Design a protein around this ligand. Structure first.
Ligand SMILES: *[C@@H]1O[C@H](CO)[C@@H](O)[C@H](O)[C@H]1NC(C)=O
Lengths: 50, 24
């Protein structure tokens, strides 16, 4: 009912499960690639592996 | 009816490169 007590009202649910494997990433945030660098000391990040 | 498996049926357990190692 629209006038049930809140503990007896309907609720919608979503549950997100994240597949954090060493397989290839396919769902990623608004992050942006640089050019690659070689043979020099650098800070790096690959798919979230800092 | 049957036969023996010997050492068939081992598989790469995880999606990671490892080399020259006696992993467990
Ligand atoms: C397994 O196979 C051998 C013959 O290759 C037989 O002697 C033995 O009894 C068998 N054991 C089982 C549990 O099937």
């Amino acid at each position: 009912q629209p006038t049930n007590g809140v503990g007896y009202q309907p609720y919608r649910v979503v549950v997100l499960s994240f597949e954090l494997l060493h397989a290839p990433a396919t769902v990623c945030g608004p992050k942006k690639s640089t050019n690659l660098v070689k043979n020099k000391c650098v800070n790096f990040n690959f798919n979230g592996l800092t | 009816a049957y036969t023996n498996s010997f050492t068939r049926g081992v598989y790469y357990p995880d999606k990671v490169f490892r080399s020259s190692v006696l992993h467990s």
